[PDB]
Design a protein around this ligand. Structure first.
Ligand code: K
Length: 263
């Protein structure tokens, strides 16, 4: 089958010169609308949601865990550390690290979450534990963002990520307090204004996590509450042929608009 939303997503893709993947879940009627929805895409920073959620899950049994101070040493600093670089030779809590990773895309913070989970395999392990058999996290920051065409490392599919984000933010993969914290974190993201949120009616409330990497990889995953009606989950992944391709957040805004117009 091929819906007219798919016809406009395909044209958007052709216009873009890149590879677009989209997956929407309408919770109201549990319907799904997908474009290259089973192809793999580099997740880039959108993988931080899985790592933050995995640490929240540990916090269900370890009740003070989010309050635990974690040292920031000079050697922990990587390529983009907007919050952590302010605390080197001091400490940050796992809550602070989670907020820095999710809301400011801090790669040092992500690496602290990965370390708390025992390595990238501990993030993948949480994905398998909540039903996601597609997600794979293989590297730490910054190398998980190489987004090399054909490389299965650090990839998921639009379908799998939208199903997972639903479970974490709207379902009960997490404890209620942990889910609420994740939602609070996602809603306060500072990096998404030009991506999914830019394609959506202003009155809709959004939580999202962006991602960016080599090959112009430009991603966003969002939980959407559109006032009146039931929430939506939308993932938009985009990647391009040239390793040094520029960011294309507009494509994600545009995919989101097409998806919103087809409701
Ligand atoms: K980042």
């Amino acid at each position: 089958q091929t819906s007219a939303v798919q016809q406009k997503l395909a044209a958007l893709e052709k216009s873009s010169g890149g590879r677009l993947g989209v997956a929407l879940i309408d919770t109201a009627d549990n319907t799904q609308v997908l474009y290259r929805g089973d192809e793999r895409f580099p997740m880039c920073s959108t993988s931080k949601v899985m790592a933050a959620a995995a640490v929240l899950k540990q916090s269900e049994t370890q009740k003070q865990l989010l309050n635990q101070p974690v040292e920031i040493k000079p050697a922990d600093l990587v390529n983009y550390n907007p919050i952590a670089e302010k605390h080197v030779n001091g400490t940050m809590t796992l809550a602070e690290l989670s907020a820095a990773a999710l809301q400011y895309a801090d790669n040092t913070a992500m690496n602290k979450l990965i370390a708390q989970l025992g390595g990238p395999g501990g993030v993948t392990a949480f994905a398998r534990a909540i039903g996601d058999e597609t997600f794979r996290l293989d590297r730490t920051e910054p190398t998980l963002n190489t987004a090399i065409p054909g490389d299965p490392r650090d990839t998921t599919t639009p379908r799998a990520m939208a199903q997972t984000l639903r479970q974490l933010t709207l379902g009960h993969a997490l404890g209620e307090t942990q889910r609420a914290q994740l939602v609070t974190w996602l809603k306060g993201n500072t990096t998404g204004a030009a991506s999914i949120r830019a394609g959506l009616p202003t009155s809709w409330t959004v939580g999202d996590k962006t991602g960016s990497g080599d090959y112009g990889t430009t991603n966003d995953i969002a939980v959407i509450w559109p006032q009146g009606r039931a929430p939506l989950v939308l993932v938009t992944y985009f990647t391009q042929p040239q390793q040094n391709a520029e960011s294309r957040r507009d494509v994600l805004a545009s995919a989101a608009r097409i998806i919103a117009e087809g409701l």
